[PDB]
Amino acid sequence: GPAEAGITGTWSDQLGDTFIVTAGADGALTGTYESAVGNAESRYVLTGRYDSAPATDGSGTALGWTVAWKNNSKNAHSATTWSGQYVGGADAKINTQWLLTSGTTNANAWKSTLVGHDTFTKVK
Amino acid sequence: GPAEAGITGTWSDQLGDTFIVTAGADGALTGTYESAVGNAESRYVLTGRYDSAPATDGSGTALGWTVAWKNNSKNAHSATTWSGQYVGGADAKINTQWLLTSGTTNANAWKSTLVGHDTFTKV
Amino acid sequence: GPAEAGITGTWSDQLGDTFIVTAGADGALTGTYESAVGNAESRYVLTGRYDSAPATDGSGTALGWTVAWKNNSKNAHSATTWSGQYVGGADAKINTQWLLTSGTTNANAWKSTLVGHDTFTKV
Amino acid sequence: GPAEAGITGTWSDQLGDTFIVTAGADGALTGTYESAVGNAESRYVLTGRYDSAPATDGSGTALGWTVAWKNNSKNAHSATTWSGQYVGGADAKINTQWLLTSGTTNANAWKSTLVGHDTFTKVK
Ligand SMILES: O=C(O)CCCC[C@@H]1SC[C@@H]2NC(=O)N[C@@H]21
Ligand SMILES: O=C(O)CCCC[C@@H]1SC[C@@H]2NC(=O)N[C@@H]21
Ligand SMILES: O=C(O)CCCC[C@@H]1SC[C@@H]2NC(=O)N[C@@H]21
Ligand SMILES: O=C(O)CCCC[C@@H]1SC[C@@H]2NC(=O)N[C@@H]21
């Protein structure tokens, strides 16, 4: 439906974090992600899931994805998930909230996870 | 590293939410998840990532995964991500926080996302 | 410091959720909040805290507050906390993330807490 | 009702973070809080709100509170809110999720906020 093609493409946010994704008819999200901030260099594997038959009543399309911050260049020992919804239209948006967990000892687990939000806009 | 075999298997929480996962040598998590609560029936595909070369200093292994709540039986128009860490050993744990976003109209978007936390133990 | 007069006043977000606050010289926030959405009518008491001696290095001023959604008109059996920072200047902002917990039975507690975010600008 | 007296008293969690609170008939929570972890020393002022007429159907009592991490001994330039519900009974609990925001420059705001959860049990 329009959400598969709508989500597929390149996205970025206002900090210049950016990702390339394909949304499949099987509900899969597959791509790579590049953060402009934090302990990250170059691109990381992204995988996730989305609702391939969203409500047709004006609602967004729910989705989520994960990046573990390890690639051939760098390993931050952390992983981020983004949970949110795709809102289509000519200026499509992906609106998300995210959790960034770092590996820690049990004693430091209380400070293991950052939370934030981010809206991405489609490049093409 | 040990996290590969250690994450691979079947996990559950106190409510009987459960999942089967394989942690690949490449950092992929793939499996199936079943919720005991919510607008959910039977199993849903899970996919995520973990740090396949975690620190060796006693820290946990970071990971995350997603489930979109649509399968052959039901579609709740929602998706959950779990972000957390695997803590190994013979009674291994995966400690998570989670975000459950439901598709909403823009007017309702302020109430789209629930947050919670959950500890799974290996079956 | 400037945060005292700068936080004190009336604030609103894009939806018309609004609050009046006084930031005390002692670190207290006290005021009243009105939501344009949700199970809410008229004004509710707000109370919180802010760092009354923030860093001087250009950082924002940390703060937080709570509203329990019971007043003379309505009781939604819920409470929201906002955690964030005040960024001063002539177009000052309060940038927040928030947690809205509803009273639930233990069985439903996994769905008790919504999460979101909101930026307020000063009227 | 039972929730006012139920919440009033001293609470602690498994790390030995602890607080003393009074829940008022006016919906107020007033007290002080002592963290066993992080950039904190001795006690900090706590203020918050709770539902003074909770549902009588088995539901918990919603509540929340704030601590800014500045006292006469220490200033961490941060503040934490806890949002959750009081569950009464002979072994009463306060179950919460929390957000800890540090003051940051706008550039570092994406890493300003930690998230976690915590269950407190009543001391007396
Ligand atoms: O520092 C790390 O642990 C690895 C990089 C984390 C970057 C975070 S993930 C949430 C936010 N969104 C971005 O694209 N970058 C930051
Ligand atoms: O109700 C829905 O929208 C779909 C089911 C959601 C179930 C949630 S996901 C977070 C928590 N953990 C579980 O295993 N189940 C609930
Ligand atoms: O529906 C309820 O349980 C009470 C009203 C909640 C309104 C929420 S609080 C977070 C967000 N910000 C607002 O100003 N309103 C919504
Ligand atoms: O380091 C700081 O910025 C000040 C202390 C923060 C302590 C946090 S607040 C959430 C968690 N619960 C606790 O009682 N202590 C930690």
Subunit contact D101:C70, Cβ cutoff 8 A: no
Q: C113: Cβ below 6 Å to ligand 3?
A: no
Residue with tokens 């994704």: A21
Query: Of D35, D31, D18, D118, whose CA–CA distance to D78 is shortest?
Result: D35
Among 2.40.128.30, 1.10.2020.10, 3.10.20.30, 1.10.600.10, what is the CATH number of D1-124? 2.40.128.30
Q: Which chain B residue shows the shortest CA-CA distance from A104? A: B59
d(CA C63, CA C85): 6
Provide the phi-psi class of D52: left if phi over 0, else alpha when psi is between -120 and 50, else beta.
Answer: alpha
Contacts by C97-100, CB closer than 8 A, 24 or more apart: C97/A115, C97/A116, C97/A117, C97/D99, C97/D101, C97/D113, C99/B115, C99/D64, C99/D81, C99/D83, C99/D97, C99/D98, C99/D99, C100/C38, C100/D83
Listed in sequence order, the residues at least 6 apart from D25 whose beta carbon sits closer than 8 Å to its beta carbon are D4, D52
Length of chain D: 124
Strand ranges for chain A from DSSP E: 9-12, 18-23, 28-34, 44-50, 61-70, 75-87, 93-102, 113-122
> Are B2 and B51 a contacting pair, CB within 8 Å?
no
A21-43 exposure pattern, b = at least 16 Cβ within 10 A, e = fewer: bebeeebbbbbbbbbeeeebeeb
Query: Of D112, B105, D96, whose CA–CA distance to C79 is shortest?
Result: D96
Q: Which two tokens stand for residue D42?
A: 């001795």
Query: Of B101, B62, B59, B61, whose CA–CA distance to B81 is shortest?
Result: B101
Q: Which two tokens stand for residue C63?
A: 């703060």
Subunit contact D116:A110, Cβ cutoff 8 A: yes
For residue A108, the SS3 value is coil
> Are D15 and D37 a contacting pair, CB within 8 Å?
yes
CATH fold label, B1-123: Lipocalin (2.40.128)
d(CA C111, CA B116): 8
d(CA B106, CA B111): 10
Domain boundaries, chain D: 1-124
> Are A79 and A68 a contacting pair, CB within 8 Å?
yes
> Are A98 and A78 a contacting pair, CB within 8 Å?
no
Tell me which residues of chain C have a C-beta less than 8 Å from any C-beta of chain A: 97, 115-117
Strand ranges for chain B from DSSP E: 9-12, 18-23, 28-34, 44-50, 61-70, 75-87, 93-102, 113-122
> Are C96 and C83 a contacting pair, CB within 8 Å?
yes
A65 is in an annotated binding site: no
Q: A80: Cβ below 6 Å to ligand 1?
A: yes
Residue with tokens 């704030």: D66
Listed in sequence order, the residues at least 6 apart from D107 whose beta carbon sits closer than 8 Å to its beta carbon are none
Helix segments in chain C, DSSP class H? 2-7
Residue type, B87: V
Q: Which ligand is the nearest neighbour of the Cα of C99?
A: 3
d(CA D78, CA C61): 8
Q: What are phi and psi of D88, to 5 degrees?
A: -85, -165
d(CA C22, CA C54): 17
Task: Give D29's DSSP letter.
Answer: E
For residue A62, the SS3 value is strand
> Are D24 and D1 a contacting pair, CB within 8 Å?
no
Listed in sequence order, the residues at least 6 apart from D89 whose beta carbon sits closer than 8 Å to its beta carbon are none
Query: Of B31, B33, B39, whose CA–CA distance to B13 is shortest?
Result: B33
Q: Which two tokens stand for residue A1?
A: 């439906």
> Are D65 and D98 a contacting pair, CB within 8 Å?
no
Tell me which residues of chain A have a C-beta less than 8 Å from any C-beta of chain C: 97, 115-117
Strand ranges for chain D from DSSP E: 9-12, 18-23, 28-34, 44-50, 61-70, 75-87, 93-102, 113-122
H/E segment holding residue B7? helix B2-7
State the nearest Cα–Cα gap between C95 and chain A, in angstroms.
Answer: 11
> Are D34 and D21 a contacting pair, CB within 8 Å?
no
Listed in sequence order, the residues at least 6 apart from A67 whose beta carbon sits closer than 8 Å to its beta carbon are A33, A44, A45, A46, A79, A80, B49, B64
d(CA D85, CA D50): 9
Q: Please, which residues bridge with residue D35 across strands? A: none
- Burial of residue A75 (CB within 10 Å: 0-12, 13-18, 19+) is middle
Listed in sequence order, the residues at least 6 apart from B50 whose beta carbon sits closer than 8 Å to its beta carbon are A68, A79, B3, B7, B23, B27, B29, B61, B62, B63, B64, B86
- Burial of residue D84 (CB within 10 Å: 0-12, 13-18, 19+) is buried
Length of chain B: 123
Query: Of C59, A111, C104, B106, whose CA–CA distance to D106 is shortest?
Result: C59
Q: What are phi and psi of A54, to 5 degrees?
A: -65, 160
